[PDB]
Design a protein around this nucleic acid. Structure first.
Ligand SMILES: [Mg+2]
Ligand SMILES: [Mg+2]
Length: 87
RNA sequence: GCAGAUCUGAGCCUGGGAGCUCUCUGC
């Protein structure tokens, strides 16, 4: 179970992309919904196509989730959820 | 300790990946 907050968690991402390019791409797509504070691509033992996007306002996160839910991104559909704990 | 680093460092856990530890670099 989750509830809305500033951050959104995205998995099922193209792991063949460089971490740098993935950040710049996510910023260009999601910044349309509002102001972004930071994008976090954590380092894991294996590439698992995970990323976080932290907006300044929750409204930006709610609209970003609904809109890009399942929308293609680098030939793969995005699975988006809310973050467990606020950032 | 903070920050970063492996489809281009590594051992585990998991076996339907929001997990643990180590190592390297900078401070
Ligand atoms: Mg597995
Ligand atoms: Mg050290």
């Amino acid at each position: 179970g989750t509830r809305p907050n500033h951050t959104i968690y995205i998995n099922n991402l193209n792991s063949k992309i460089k971490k740098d390019e993935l950040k710049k791409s996510l910023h260009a797509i999601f910044s349309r919904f509002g102001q972004i504070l930071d994008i976090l691509v954590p380092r894991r033992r294996t590439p698992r196509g995970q990323a976080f996007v932290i907006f300044k306002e929750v409204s930006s996160a709610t609209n970003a989730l609904r809109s890009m839910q399942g929308f293609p991104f680098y030939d793969k559909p995005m699975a988006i959820q809310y973050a467990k704990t606020d950032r």
